[PDB]
Amino acid sequence: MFLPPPECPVFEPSWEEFADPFAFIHKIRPIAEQTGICKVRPPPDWQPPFACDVDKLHFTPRIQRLNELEAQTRVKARDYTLRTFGEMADAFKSDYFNMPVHMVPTELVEKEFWRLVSTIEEDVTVEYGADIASKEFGSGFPVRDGIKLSPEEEEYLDSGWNLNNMPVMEQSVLAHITADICGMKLPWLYVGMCFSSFCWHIEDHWSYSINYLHWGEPKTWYGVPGYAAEQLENVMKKLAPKLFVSQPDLLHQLVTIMNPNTLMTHEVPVYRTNQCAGEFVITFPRAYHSGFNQGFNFAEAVNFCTVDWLPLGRQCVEHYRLLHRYCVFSHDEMICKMASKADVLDVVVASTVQKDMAIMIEDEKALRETVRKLGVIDSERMDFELLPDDERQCVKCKTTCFMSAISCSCKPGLLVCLHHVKELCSCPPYKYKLRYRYTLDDLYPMMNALKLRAES
Numbered sequence: 001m002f003l004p005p006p007e008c009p010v011f012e013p014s015w016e017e018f019a020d021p022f023a024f025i026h027k028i029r030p031i032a033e034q035t036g037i038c039k040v041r042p043p044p045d046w047q048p049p050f051a052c053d054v055d056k057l058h059f060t061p062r063i064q065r066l067n068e069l070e071a072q073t074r075v076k077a078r079d080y081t082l083r084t085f086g087e088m089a090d091a092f093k094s095d096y097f098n099m100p101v102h103m104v105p106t107e108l109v110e111k112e113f114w115r116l117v118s119t120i121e122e123d124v125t126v127e128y129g130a131d132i133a134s135k136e137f138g139s140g141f142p143v144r145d146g147i148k149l150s151p152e153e154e155e156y157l158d159s160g161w162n163l164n165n166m167p168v169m170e171q172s173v174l175a176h177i178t179a180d181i182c183g184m185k186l187p188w189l190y191v192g193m194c195f196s197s198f199c200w201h202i203e204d205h206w207s208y209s210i211n212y213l214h215w216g217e218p219k220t221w222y223g224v225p226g227y228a229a230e231q232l233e234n235v236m237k238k239l240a241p242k243l244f245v246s247q248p249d250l251l252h253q254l255v256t257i258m259n260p261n262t263l264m265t266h267e268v269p270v271y272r273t274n275q276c277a278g279e280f281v282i283t284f285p286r287a288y289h290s291g292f293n294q295g296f297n298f299a300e301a302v303n304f305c306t307v308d309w310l311p312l313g314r315q316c317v318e319h320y321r322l323l324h325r326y327c328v329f330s331h332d333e334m335i336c337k338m339a340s341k342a343d344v345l346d347v348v349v350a351s352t353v354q355k356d357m358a359i360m361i362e363d364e365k366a367l368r369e370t371v372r373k374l375g376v377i378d379s380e381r382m383d384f385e386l387l388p389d390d391e392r393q394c395v396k397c398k399t400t401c402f403m404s405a406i407s408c409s410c411k412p413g414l415l416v417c418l419h420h421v422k423e424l425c426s427c428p429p430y431k432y433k434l435r436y437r438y439t440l441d442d443l444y445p446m447m448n449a450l451k452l453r454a455e456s
């Protein structure tokens with residue numbers, strides 16, 4: 001038996017409220033952060049025209065075995081065209097229920113999905129055109145191409161809700177990042193079929209996510225607020241400890257399907273929604289989400305970071321350190337890049353960056369004092385941003401170093417962060433060197449530039 005979780009919040013903004021996606025996300029935040037997920041219905045007349053081909057888009061989907069609490073990789077079979085996939089997906093659903101596809105109630109597909117995943121005896125497998133990059137097969141939204149676009153497509157070219165534009169807006173903080181982070185700046189496409197699913201997870205660096213269902217049958221979502229994150233993790237650890245083991249890579253991350261009633265029984269707040277064609281779903285920082293597709297569909301998604309997120313981004317990197325998890329980027333490097341462009345930053349952005357930079361500088365001061373008292377006397381400036389990520393990870397916690405690291409003449413090429421000085425080599429401290437990006441003296445004027453920009 002399945003007891004559907006309560007409905008998540010649904011917003012229907014006016015053209016005025018809709019005008020700015022970031023001001024709207026800030027306005028809904030007090031409500032939506034209590035549920036983790038929320039649904040946004042654009043004004044009735046906001047209708048972008050679709051941009052991908054049925055016979056020219058090709059993809060190899062991931063095969064999915066429908067088994068609850070069975071470990072799966074976050075990212076990992078034949079070739080399909082969007083047309084051939086749809087024929088397969090439609091024949092599957094209609095044969096499964098012995099009904100015309102539009103006639104299958106959503107409540108029934110939902111109950112069936114949850115029965116199916118818990119029944120050991122049924123070995124149902126589906127396919128999911130998941131994490132297809134927008135860079136290669138193109139966005140479902142209009143984009144500037146050196147092809148001719150109809151004035152209808154030109155209306156939506158510069159919309160903040162066109163998911164190609166959201167990352168590069170000034171209210172976005174990932175915009176300013178020069179470093180290669182294609183997984184967090186570029187949209188991903190999801191070609192679903194009945195029962196194709198996404199396991200319980202959170203976004204990298206606890207970022208927000210925005211998902212648009214371009215067309216097709218609904219996408220069913222389950223969401224948990226950010227405040228209940230550790231509570232969900234404690235529940236999932238007791239029932240499936242197998243996927244909670246330490247991982248030596250980001251590409252090897254273990255996720256699973258878990259019934260939301262199991263979470264609800266353990267007093268974890270869970271909300272649901274059926275996202276229909278033309279609707280958006282926004283996931284908030286550290287908000288756990290999972291779901292499945294009701295049928296053949298096409299969605300597009302991108303991650304994003306607001307000014308509200310900056311302190312959480314710092315807390316996340318601190319959490320990755322404790323867990324020995326690899327970072328996608330250095331948060332401190334991002335803060336310093338924004339500090340270096342203080343003059344061109346939005347005044348609200350500059351103000352928030354300044355507040356995080358003050359924390360970073362104060363933590364750096366303490367860490368430098370501690371490593372001096374450990375006997376590390378020699379020091380040399382280092383341009384950490386020039387090193388490939390694999391060349392600047394803490395041997396112990398795997399953090400991407402930016403502000404500083406410790407090196408040893410005994411272990412060439414190896415680096416530790418200032419938290420793990422004792423993990424580097426087995427040589428005396430006088431043989432170590434403090435490698436730093438900036439002196440404390442260079443850092444205070446970088447912060448003053450931000451203060452001048454925010455005070456203007």
Ligand SMILES: NCCc1cnn(-c2nccc3c(=O)[nH]cnc23)c1
Pocket residue numbers: 074075130131183188190197198201203209211219289299
């Ligand atoms: N490389 C990105 C990995 C990633 C991060 N979130 N996520 C998802 N979140 C939300 C929704 C979906 C979905 O509808 N289908 C597949 N995946 C989804 C996937």
Ligand SMILES: [Mn+2]
Pocket residue numbers: 066067068116117118119120121122123124
């Ligand atoms: Mn099963």
Ligand SMILES: [Mn+2]
Pocket residue numbers: 201202203209283289
């Ligand atoms: Mn997600």
Ligand SMILES: [Zn+2]
Pocket residue numbers: 394395396397398399416417418419420
């Ligand atoms: Zn470390």
